[PDB]
Design a protein around this ligand. Structure first.
Ligand SMILES: [Zn+2]
Lengths: 102, 52, 124, 81, 62, 217, 97, 88, 245
């Protein structure tokens, strides 16, 4: 039960999106459930990169396309790593993935 | 199923698509029909606990 | 409005074991999302009325201008020749095929979503 | 399941249509010339002239003419022939 | 017939006003709405493999 | 502040998605020499900001011209692109967009005897891009006016609902002509926006910056 | 009635299932339904040209006739070619009728 | 435990209270952001094309009304009428 | 008798410290725009710093950005205000974009004021709450100050370093003047060798110096060659300048 809230939030949010996307899901519920994804997509629209995935598969970039998708959904693991960073700060150590060679 | 959720969408209560059915374009396969039946079983959570 | 999974977690943790399985449908329905019911209509809103009045005003003004145009009966019959094809398009166009063909133009609706494959996100 | 949430909002115009209608009307009425069939005169000529002598026969064609060229008004008979 | 208009600049300015409004309405009201629902699906469909491997490695419940 | 809520997977959103991606695929990006990673990502973003938005402009022109072309096929309405100034102004403004892009690429500096005829073949497409649309929208409507003036004289001179087949054989022809008008109203919007992509993408070529230093092996 | 709903349901009935392709028989003479709507189109055009000619009939045509005459007129302002002559002929014909 | 303040403004669940308002894009709120971020840095070629066409057609309208002025002047300085005497 | 009243009212009604009594009801707006008008005036920014204190913690992100870059441009440092601004950033770190956080970090790198919570929340925001090409849209003169602000406080965040190192390239360095390009190459190489993090995009920072060595001293070229050797050993290869052709 230590990190059940984050995993079950991810599960419930994507289950609702996938059940309703492309059928009847409003954009307000999408921007409510996933605010930072909408923020990053609006950054791509604001900064003239609205065709950035079209640009990436126009130039054959598959790894950069997967990196683009994974960096736009990188805030899903932000609650977990903030929780684990504060656990390691309560136990006097440092969080492992925050380090360069460690 | 996906056709059964498309039938309840606002697009099929519009005028030009009011008599049509989303099952007519691509029908759901037997796996998503039986998955809809199994999911209709498990919306009672005590059924899911006892079958788990 | 806090998130409904923490509501499920709280509403399950403060229930005794004697009345857990009775109370499970109440917590299932307390955290189901709101799908608002069909409210009473009061149809033809102010912008729909502006649209229909402006369309009728435009059709009347264009028909006043067509009928005094020195080739006037030719214009009034061209309106018939065009409304005939409107009537013909509303009768032979397959609208379900057009719906599912426009739906295939977008990659968002040409296929279902793909992430979160239900084994990565279990909490055992 | 969200189908009755979209039926609540009725018809609604495109989100900047007042700018398009204002621009097209501000091009059709802010022309800078007389209104295509009229001519500007002096004020004394306007105050001296009857209203039927101030209209032209061309600019009032018959709404459903039995003969092509039929007009409603006949204008000024003061021809300078 | 009607071949030259009464003012050519008025008709060219009507074309410029209409196409500039269609450009603004596209770029402002439609293309954000296009791109939100296109890129939610696109980021999920491109991220899915690496996202699920990262989430498999991150949860200790196996 | 209070914008409207949009259903996901609406038919206008799907249609405009397909249309925008079609016109964006006309001038695709260039695949660089080096593989695209975090090293090449600012060069790719920079090449994507030195390319003109011909996708957005071409779907702008496609949507405005197909709406103005299909206005001429609704009753009580004339096409706005059957005006000489409207259609020819859209053509001259596409040509001026391509020329202003190509002038800002070099220096805003204006470029034997073989090249001035290449210039008067290049400056003609301002006229041609607009008046192809204008004459296509005008000529079908003019033939429609004339041939329904000839189709009205025989029920005028003979009886109404009497001697039907000579009027039937010209009303079938009028129906076929308005069907050709629908086909031309779609295809001329397509031809205008394909040609706008061609003319503007002639000058849509800049220098890929790329890496000026590397750590190889 | 509701001014949004009754005519909506009536038009839904008329558009969808109030079909005169079978309620007026009509399978026994035509081959397909793609041939019926192709003939319903030209029938709509012929009905439109006859109704718009008949609704105001005593008129001099703007369109070039082929040198023919509608009914027993044959020299009248209905059959004239120059429009000022037909204009004054209509001006004398109108006071008597 | 992971306690709903790590999920604040990051991950939300489908709403149970009421459906919210749609989050506006920065172009849908202010025209200044659109005009200074996309309209001028990306579409100034189109705006220059539209202004070139409007000035060129103003030039052609000036040529046409100066031709009308020339014909009207050489009908007035000939004693002749400069039009078709109206028509009616 | 007009010149007498104009001369007595030219500093009785219109003075440079009665505008600051109307400029107190919306203080980030007026603070930012009078700072952009050059009105630095520390004796009025003492008034501004206490006029905004009871309402900093409920401000927008743009209001906090306006306040913070204005108090950078007026060179005034009220740490009792900057703790409230740090609370506003740390309580709403998901709502800040990189164009705002780079200005706020450049201000806080002027006036050396930090926490572990602020560094962690700004790194979390730039890495996960913003777009991963927002460093590419930044211009290296602010990513260098972000790397400096992280190397000063010794805060190792390899996710933030990999995100910020995307914004260093030929494109983002070629938009700088040669003095400023020397400044950002030196500060970026120093803050990259401080953390021991040698990404693939450090070769753009190195080749910004190696194609034009006429700007640096022998000590500065030693500082570039040290990181070039360390990054040759870390990235597992040998450095090579690329020539066009
Ligand atoms: Zn017509």
């Amino acid at each position: 039960e230590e990190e059940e809230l984050w995993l079950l939030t991810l599960t419930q949010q994507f289950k609702h999106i996938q059940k309703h996307f492309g059928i009847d899901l409003p954009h307000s519920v999408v921007a409510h459930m996933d605010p930072l994804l909408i923020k990053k997509i609006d950054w791509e629209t604001t900064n003239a990169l609205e065709d950035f995935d079209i640009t990436l598969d126009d130039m054959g970039a598959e790894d950069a396309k997967e990196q683009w998708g994974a960096e736009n959904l990188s805030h899903h693991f932000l609650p977990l790593i903030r929780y684990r960073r504060d656990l390691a700060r309560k136990n006097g150590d440092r969080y492992g993935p925050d380090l360069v060679n460690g | 199923t996906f056709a059964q959720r498309l039938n309840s969408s606002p697009a099929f209560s519009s005028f030009l698509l009011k008599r049509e059915k989303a099952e007519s374009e691509v029908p759901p396969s037997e796996l998503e029909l039986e998955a809809a039946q199994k999911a209709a079983e498990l919306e009672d959570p005590e059924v899911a606990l006892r079958t788990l | 409005e806090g998130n409904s999974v923490a509501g499920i977690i709280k509403s399950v943790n403060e229930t005794s074991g004697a009345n857990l399985l009775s109370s499970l449908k109440t917590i299932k329905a307390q955290a189901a999302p709101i799908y608002p019911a069909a409210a009473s209509s009061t149809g033809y809103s102010t912008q729909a009325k502006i649209a229909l009045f402006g369309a009728l005003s435009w059709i009347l003004y264009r028909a006043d201008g067509q009928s005094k145009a020195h080739e006037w009966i030719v214009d009034l019959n061209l309106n018939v020749l065009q409304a005939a094809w409107l009537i013909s398009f509303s009768s032979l166009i397959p609208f379900r095929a057009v719906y599912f063909a426009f739906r295939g133009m977008a990659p968002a609706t040409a296929s279902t979503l793909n992430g979160l494959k239900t084994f990565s996100s279990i909490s055992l | 399941s969200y189908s009755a949430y979209f039926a609540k909002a009725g018809f609604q115009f495109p989100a900047g249509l007042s700018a398009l209608v204002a621009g097209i009307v501000a091009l059709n009425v802010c022309t800078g010339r007389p209104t295509k069939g009229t001519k500007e005169i002096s004020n004394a000529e306007y105050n001296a002239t009857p209203i039927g002598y101030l209209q032209s026969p061309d600019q009032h064609p018959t709404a459903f003419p039995k003969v092509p060229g039929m007009k409603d008004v006949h204008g000024s008979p003061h021809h300078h022939h | 017939m009607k071949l030259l208009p009464e003012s050519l600049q008025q008709e060219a300015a009507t074309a410029a006003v209409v196409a500039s409004w269609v450009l603004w309405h596209l770029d402002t009201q439609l293309l954000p709405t296009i791109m939100r629902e296109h890129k939610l699906h696109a980021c999920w469909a491109a991220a899915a493999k690496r996202y699920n491997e990262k989430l498999f490695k991150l949860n200790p419940s196996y | 502040s209070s914008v409207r809520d949009v259903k996901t997977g609406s038919l206008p959103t799907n249609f405009l998605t397909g249309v925008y991606r079609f016109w964006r695929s006309q001038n695709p990006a260039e695949k660089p020499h080096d593989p695209v990673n975090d090293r090449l990502l600012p060069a790719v973003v920079d090449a994507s900001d030195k390319r003109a938005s011909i996708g957005t402009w071409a779907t702008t022109f496609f949507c405005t011209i197909i709406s103005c072309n299909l206005l001429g096929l609704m009753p009580f309405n004339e096409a706005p692109t059957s005006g000489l100034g409207f259609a020819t102004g859209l053509g001259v403004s596409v040509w001026a967009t391509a020329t202003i892009l190509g002038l800002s690429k070099t220096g805003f500096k204006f470029p034997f005897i073989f090249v001035p005829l290449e210039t008067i073949s290049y400056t003609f497409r301002a006229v041609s891009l607009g008046v192809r649309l204008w004459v296509n929208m005008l000529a079908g409507h003019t033939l429609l006016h004339i041939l329904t003036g000839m189709a009205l004289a025989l029920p005028f001179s003979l009886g109404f609902f009497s001697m039907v087949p000579a009027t039937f054989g010209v009303c079938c022809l009028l129906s076929a002509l308005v069907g050709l008008e629908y086909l031309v109203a779609v295809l001329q919007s397509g031809v205008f926006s394909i040609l706008s992509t061609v003319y503007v993408g002639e000058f849509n070529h800049d220098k890929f910056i790329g890496p000026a230093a590397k750590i190889v092996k | 009635m509701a001014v949004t709903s009754f005519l909506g349901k009536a038009f839904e009935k008329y558009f969808y299932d109030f079909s005169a392709y079978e309620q007026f028989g009509l399978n026994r003479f035509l081959s397909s339904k793609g041939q019926y709507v192709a003939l319903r189109h030209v029938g709509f055009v012929m009905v439109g040209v006859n109704v718009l000619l008949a609704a105001n009939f005593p008129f001099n045509p703007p369109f070039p006739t082929i040198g023919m005459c509608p009914a027993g007129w044959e020299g009248t302002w209905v059959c004239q070619a120059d429009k000022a002559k037909a204009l004054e002929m209509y001006k004398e014909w109108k006071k008597s009728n | 435990v992971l306690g709903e303040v790590y999920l604040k403004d990051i991950l939300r669940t489908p709403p149970t209270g009421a459906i919210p308002a749609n989050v506006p894009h920065p172009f849908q709120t202010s025209f200044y952001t659109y005009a200074t971020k996309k309209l001028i840095p990306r579409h100034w070629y189109l705006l220059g094309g539209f202004t070139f066409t409007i000035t060129l057609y103003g030039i052609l309208d000036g040529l046409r009304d100066s031709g009308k002025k020339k014909a009207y002047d050489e009908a007035i300085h000939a004693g002749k009428t400069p039009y078709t005497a109206g028509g009616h | 008798p007009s010149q007498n009243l104009v001369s007595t009212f030219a500093n009785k009604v219109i003075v440079e410290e009665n505008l600051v009594n109307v400029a107190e009801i919306d203080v980030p707006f007026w603070s930012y725009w009078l700072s952009s008008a050059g009105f630095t005036s520390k004796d009025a920014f003492v008034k501004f710093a206490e006029a905004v204190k009871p309402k900093v913690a409920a401000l927008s992100t743009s209001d906090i950005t306006n306040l913070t870059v204005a108090f950078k441009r007026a060179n005034y440092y009220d740490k009792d205000l900057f703790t409230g601004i740090e609370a506003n950033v740390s309580a709403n770190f998901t709502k800040f974009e990189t164009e705002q956080l780079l200005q706020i970090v450049a201000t806080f790198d002027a006036f050396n004021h930090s926490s572990v919570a602020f560094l962690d929340d700004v790194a979390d925001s730039i890495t996960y709450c913003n777009h991963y090409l927002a460093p590419v849209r930044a211009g290296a003169d602010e990513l260098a100050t972000l790397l400096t602000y992280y190397a000063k406080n010794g805060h190792e965040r390899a996710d933030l370093l990999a995100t910020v190192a995307r914004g260093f390239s030929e494109v983002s360095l070629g938009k700088l003047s040669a003095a400023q390009r020397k400044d950002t190459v030196l500060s970026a190489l120093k803050a990259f060798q401080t953390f021991g993090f040698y990404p693939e995009s450090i070769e753009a920072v190195i080749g910004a110096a190696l194609v034009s060595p006429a700007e640096y001293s022998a000590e500065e070229l030693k500082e570039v060659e040290a990181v070039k050797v360390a990054a040759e050993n870390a990235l597992g290869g040998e450095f090579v300048l690329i020539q066009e052709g």
